Design a protein around this ligand. Structure first.
Ligand SMILES: [Zn+2]
Ligand SMILES: [Zn+2]
Ligand SMILES: [Zn+2]
Ligand SMILES: [Zn+2]
Ligand SMILES: [Zn+2]
Ligand SMILES: [Zn+2]
Lengths: 445, 445, 445
């Protein structure tokens, strides 16, 4: 079964370039699997029920999905997995328009997370994100997703012949300005104060067509980024490899998500099985949608308070915290696979292989956490590797936790690699955790 | 009386080398003094009663102990002390086994804190920690403490004759690899995939005998570290000094703990007297057992909600926070004593002496905090010093707070020093705070 | 049998911290074994006898002991071993008193031979040496040994927090000044011209109590040093290691000494068997008690002249030198064992192992010397190693010679390392040399 996840992972990576696409992807699969959305502005305290499946969203870039076991009662524990779905990228400036320079049309961008490193030069870049549109019919402000299907942007290297490097000194504001087109005419869209006037005129027209809008003044704002247009693929002589960009945690997040969809719901399951995918981890994770934010804790408190009303039980501290005491959090970010050409950096016995299994990262993880996940791995038919050179929902909730990752090479590159079976082996371990946590917890004292 | 704590402190330091021994030490003395343990998974909302004495544990490395005044009612303040019981130490790697090299058997370790500094060379190192054992009788997973009573490990310097230093370049992964034994045979324990196989065979057998086990496959994991085998002692011509390692906060923590054990329970005490000892402050103090984690706030809320049930009072924000507004938090970490040989680093009037009293550390502390603790010091018969070059439970609970410390030389050394009266003077001040806080708070407006 | 020397070596190291204690230790064992002291101011030319046993002393820091074979006649050779019993240490200055500074009482000291090094920081240091006392009963000037049984002194590191290192710039004069006590009174013994007045007042009183003396002016002078108070011990998982300080040649000297005490006296022994232990090799060994001084040569000439009287043979050059031509000198200083973490410094084939045997050091040693001692090792049941990166009584006497050493790690550290069987393996070899030299010499031409 692990190879059964290779191409679905490939298609996921290719067609969901931005964090907004990822949540939209997860949201449509959860709805087709029968999950019910819980809007934050609505009262939940009536409507949660054992055997139910739910999800909730924040800023359309953060999502928490969970299933409540049929044997669930207030005070029972949660098996939860956390990951981040943001990736290093380059966002269009509030004013992205630039002067046409030596006949080239350029684009103002800002490196989001420190993204524009040497691997970004001479890549075919496309654009995508969300647009804030004022709907023609309703007069309500809305959000729509957009993507250009061919490369519009590029950051060109300089020839080595000039004595500098090809990358120059590497300065991102002067030398890394993307090139989006040609205008040689030396040989404008929207009312002068509008948003559209701050952006390149063909970018606006291109975006308006994809949204089926004609009036530039319908666009209040957008959030757009550049991403590598090259599809995810398998490679190697035997196709053991996956080549794709944005692997830093779209990989572990996708695996955790698929784990939840594929998890058991046994009539005897007494725990809540939960996956939390967060935005903004490469900036530290503290923002409304980040992992150091209220999002997951207040969601958990809402769920528990909801079941407390149904059972006429008082909600408070220590019904919460009897819950936390019975819970376990797997915090999953990608880890470094053994690098064959920098062996300086491979700590022996602690440097994970590709196409083997998940690595337990140690420096959150500790002897108890490792005993728990090694045991789960055995019930799952998984082998757990070790790696050493937002993990800290653990502190916010006082939940026992471990750091866990799928091995990867060239982390933070615009295009990285893992083994072709690593997504599936990931799904296999996470599913093993959600399914066996409650059983394993009862083997302790 | 301060001298009456010198040998008890000595014995404490000598026989409790790891954070797990410290909690076990506190737990046995709390139980012998009649404290009741509150397990997180159980409901407390019935049990708590004025005049009662309790404690709670997290991961066996974090502990919170408190007494409820007989005059206590919901809304009354808490007099609380926080400290950390972790110390810089070197933890065994997940795979601690190494190739025998030039006839030596070595041990894979990782500096936990940033610990392995120059003072760690040529010290007699022993090993200790916790083991995750599979009880053959019950079949339940358990935890046991272990210690080897003689030095097993050493990090040898190089002779100066070779042109390098004795310490070399100081690189921790190549040049400081402990040496645990000799094997010259060039002139194995457990099923090949088990945990025992990742460890030195001879350490595993040594650990199994200490725990009275035969089969290597009964050990699922362990958490072991290296510590200095040399006992704590008194020193100097007049025995004014205490020479011991791991003083960075085992000292302030132990004195705080003893203050609680020695505090008044007057029939007129209306506050709660609490001590919180945390793990992982040298790592920034957030994960599950850390100081910027859930542990102390959720415990306090649980206690308050419990007494709210008993008195049929609603629990919520503003019964909590009336509580916080009547509270005070002494966050106690060790401080730097005047160093006689680096006088450049001694800020005059702000550089505390040994065998005098506790230092108020200023850079949390403020004119109000100092007014209170100077006032408590006067009722206690104490003299407070000043020091200047997890404090931030204060922000999490909005509690009035100060940073307080017992002066020390050679902080973060494998072996440090303070005055022989400094533990006692510590207990004396902390006891003064817990006993007099409520009285002092009523002198204000 | 080599294990039979482990604890007696451990006890020797622990209780004889200074060169003065070493000579006193050797002296009482020689006397208990029936050796006769030869005072330098007395004529010996009557009093030496075949089968006799004798020793001689210089400054109470140097000693030469020997046995005369029963078959001895003038012109017969000597099997002699030479070593040094001084060790790197810190002497008290002539005026050790210091100003009390920031409440600390300090002690003026001087490094004896580049001794204070990185490993001397944060060690528990005690004091010992000899005292020159004025005898009240007799009025004679005399010498007494003294040792304090608990740590009186410490050289404290600075916390890393201050931006310097813990060791500072390392300057031994301002930054390494030992700390002996506390005086906070800012919050004396003897006539003002006497020796006692130049020293710390409580040091003087402490020393006087140990010698059972009341009057400070009975002390004319003393020679005192700081040494590591930590006992010698065995360590390692199976206790294959010895951890002790001052191993540089207390180890080889002690082994040589016990070899003499354990040597054969066969009725057919025709050679003198002799051990010379010298002071000050770390200073290059020229002064009265050093190895480049007259001590051993003039003692040998005295012995030879004495037996020339008894046999009415003329003494002169060429009865001496027939003697030297039949002799052999084993010059024994410790050597560097293979270091497992600096392999750059281990010369393959030439880097000796712990718990194997003595290494023959080559750079005095030569093809002839090696053939002799390899042959002696075979008769003794010993394994000789090779080592490669004052031996020069060889030049003074024109005696054939070799440099041999017991391997050791971290030479010149305040606390070094050897194998637990290495002292024993040392005495086994040295005994082999003394017993078999005459036999082996007759296998040559
Ligand atoms: Zn990252
Ligand atoms: Zn990541
Ligand atoms: Zn610290
Ligand atoms: Zn601290
Ligand atoms: Zn030396
Ligand atoms: Zn030497």
């Amino acid at each position: 079964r692990p190879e059964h996840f290779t191409q679905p992972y490939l298609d996921f990576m290719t067609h969901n370039p931005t964090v907004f696409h990822v949540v939209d992807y997860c949201k449509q699969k959860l709805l087709k699997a029968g999950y019910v959305e819980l809007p934050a502005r609505d009262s939940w305290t009536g409507k949660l029920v054992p055997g139910g499946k739910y999800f909730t969203t924040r800023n359309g870039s953060s999502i928490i999905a969970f299933t409540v076991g049929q044997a669930y009662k207030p005070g029972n524990g949660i098996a939860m997995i956390a990951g981040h779905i943001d990736a290093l990228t380059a966002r269009l400036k509030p004013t992205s328009v630039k002067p046409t320079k030596e006949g080239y049309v350029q684009l103002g961008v800002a490196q989001y997370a420190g993204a524009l490193n040497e691997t970004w030069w001479d890549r075919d870049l496309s654009v995508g994100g969300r647009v804030i549109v004022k709907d023609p019919k309703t007069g309500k402000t809305t959000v729509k997703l957009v993507k250009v299907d061919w490369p519009v942007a590029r950051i060109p290297t300089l020839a080595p012949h000039f004595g500098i490097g090809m990358t120059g000194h590497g300065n991102r504001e002067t030398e890394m300005v993307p090139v989006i087109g040609i205008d040689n005419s030396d040989l404008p869209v929207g009312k002068p104060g509008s948003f559209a006037s701050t952006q390149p005129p063909k970018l606006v027209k291109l975006i308006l067509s994809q949204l089926g809008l004609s009036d530039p003044d319908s666009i209040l704002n957008w959030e757009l980024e550049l991403f590598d247009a090259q599809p995810a693929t398998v490679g190697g002589l035997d196709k053991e490899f996956i080549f794709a960009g944005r692997i830093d945690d779209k990989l572990c997040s996708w695996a955790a998500f698929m784990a939840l969809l594929h998890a058991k719901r046994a009539p005897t399951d007494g725990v809540i099985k939960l996956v939390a995918l967060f935005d903004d981890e490469e900036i530290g994770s503290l923002l409304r949608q980040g992992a150091r934010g209220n999002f997951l804790p207040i969601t958990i408190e809402r769920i528990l308070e909801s079941f407390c009303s149904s059972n006429s039980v008082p909600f408070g501290p220590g019904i919460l915290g009897q819950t936390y005491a019975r819970s376990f959090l797997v915090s999953s970010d990608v880890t470094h696979a053994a690098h064959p050409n920098f062996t300086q950096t491979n700590l022996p016995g602690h440097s994970p292989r590709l196409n083997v299994g998940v690595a337990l990262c140690v420096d959150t993880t500790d002897s108890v956490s490792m005993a728990i996940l090694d045991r789960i791995a055995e019930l799952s038919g998984c082998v757990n590797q070790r790696h050493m050179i937002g993990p800290m929902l653990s502190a916010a909730m006082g939940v026992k936790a471990a750091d866990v990752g799928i091995p990867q090479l060239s982390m933070h590159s615009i295009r990285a690699m893992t083994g072709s079976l690593d997504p599936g082996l990931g799904v296999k371990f996470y599913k093993g955790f959600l399914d066996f946590w409650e059983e394993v917890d009862l083997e302790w004292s």
